[PDB]
Design a protein around this ligand. Structure first.
Ligand code: NAG
Ligand code: NAG
Ligand code: DKA
Ligand code: DKA
Lengths: 269, 269
């Protein structure tokens, strides 16, 4: 339901997203090769990818992640890590919205995710600009799973049209703002947003629509089971804001589904 | 390199072993359907399988597991759960042997494992017997992963030749006794033992042969990677006591390899 090529990018950034949790980045030297424990990111290892900068508990919302260069694929990946503990993170979740005219007008976004990014958008924006210029023929990409996915999306909105096209791949990302914002994310130029969901996974269902949140379009839904391998024939593109019939359905949601995006994600073996 | 049927059996008991960690099982009423969270045991769920007896922290080794009834595949299954923290369990493992001429002559076995089985053998032999009585037509199978696979192996060598066959399927089980014992476990009749290992899994390398431990024969070694699906051409039968070229190879071992045996095992999503 997507091309073999699109599937491959979904799989590759699924792993880049995974690395935010299982790569040994902790205070890892700039320039080092990116590796992950427990086979979390083989395709990243299979490439000429190195850390260009790494961050932890960075800024006011404790953002954590890393920026990287892929000479094999010609990319400049910014990966955001989600919570060290997603289950608790899910229950501590606050649904409060906050004015974000700066991104767009009449756009309201999750206060937490937005504050977290502004606080770090300065340090990180420059680190990114330095890279395109060196690798201008290299696709810049923003990625993240769970909370990390939300952070990647906000950054992907806050940073478009400065010169370079920013593509975003999010995995099991929560809703990030109000209907206006979803509208924006669905049509914004200077990039494409790939919002990937899996089976019933609960995070893409929060905050609720009943708290004023809304999802951008389209949605790339993975129909294959938890712990089951994903083929191109298992993903479905679902068009239209807040479309239902994908991950946005009225059944009982699940947390394990959130940890399986093409592989093991959000946790390390 | 294995018959589709044996493969299906390996997969089935990997799940029964996985069920010992991810089933609801902690206080469930006998008669209750066996289910697991995070898609840890679809084959067991798809079977008319129920709890015959659940035990938690029983005896002196804080043994945990369950006795089950499967009418779909006609089995009585005794599944032992490995440790709740395997890395710490690995670190605290002590290599002490203790004499076990009751099991076989010249036989010495890991004090801990043998001790722990001993403390619960009466109750379990009992419940197993009731089950057999009620189901003469049923194949009795002991199974377990990591420490649970050790207990499974002991229990089975202990209660065999009571006129009922015992098959044992262990997943990443440590060495359990001395060479005399290994030799026994290799030739004992009234039920086969299928030792199953994966790649560079660390546990089947403990305790070290250096401390007087040995591995029974044969060994079913899974060649496929961690998080990679197993096909019957990925399993290799390694004949010979203390045979190398399976899991017993001179390279650095890995814990993640321990948590994969034809699906996620020893941990729950
Ligand atoms: C870094 O990656 C390259 C090519 O992908 C590999 O040859 C190299 O050995 C890795 N770095 C180190 C320091 O081993
Ligand atoms: C348990 O499994 C059986 C058949 O495998 C089924 O008919 C029964 O309704 C199930 N129980 C529950 C509570 O779903
Ligand atoms: C004032 C009490 C502290 C509660 C912490 C909750 C953090 C939630 C922020 C968020 O929505 O991600
Ligand atoms: C003196 C109390 C410490 C013993 C802790 C139990 C460790 C068991 C050794 C083993 O599992 O092989």
């Amino acid at each position: 339901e997507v091309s073999q090529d699109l599937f491959n990018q979904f799989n590759l950034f699924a792993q880049y997203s995974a690395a935010a949790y299982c790569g040994k980045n902790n205070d890892a030297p700039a320039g080092t090769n990116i590796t992950c424990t427990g086979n979390a990111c083989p395709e990243v290892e299979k490439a000429d990818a190195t850390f260009l900068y790494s961050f932890e508990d960075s800024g006011v919302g404790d953002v954590t992640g890393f920026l990287a260069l892929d000479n094999t694929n010609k990319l400049i990946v910014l990966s955001f890590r989600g919570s060290r503990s997603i289950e608790n993170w899910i229950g501590n979740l606050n649904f409060d919205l906050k004015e974000i005219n700066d991104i767009c007008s009449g756009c309201r976004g999750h206060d937490g995710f937005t504050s977290s990014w502004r606080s770090v958008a300065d340090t990180l924006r420059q680190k990114v600009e330095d890279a395109v210029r060196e690798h201008p023929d290299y696709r810049v990409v923003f990625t993240g799973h769970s909370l990390g996915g939300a952070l990647a999306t906000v950054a992907g909105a806050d940073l478009r049209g400065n010169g370079y096209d920013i593509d975003v791949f999010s995995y099991g990302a929560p809703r990030v703002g109000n209907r206006a914002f979803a509208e924006f994310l669905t049509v914004q130029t200077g990039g494409t947003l790939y919002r990937i969901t899996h089976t019933n996974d609960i995070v893409p269902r929060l905050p609720p629509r009943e708290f004023g949140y809304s999802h951008s379009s389209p949605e790339y839904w993975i129909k294959s089971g938890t712990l089951v391998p994903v083929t191109r024939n298992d993903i479905v593109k679902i068009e239209g804001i807040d479309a239902t019939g994908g991950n946005n359905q009225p059944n009982i949601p699940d947390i394990p589904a959130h940890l399986w995006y093409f592989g093991l994600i959000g946790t390390c073996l």
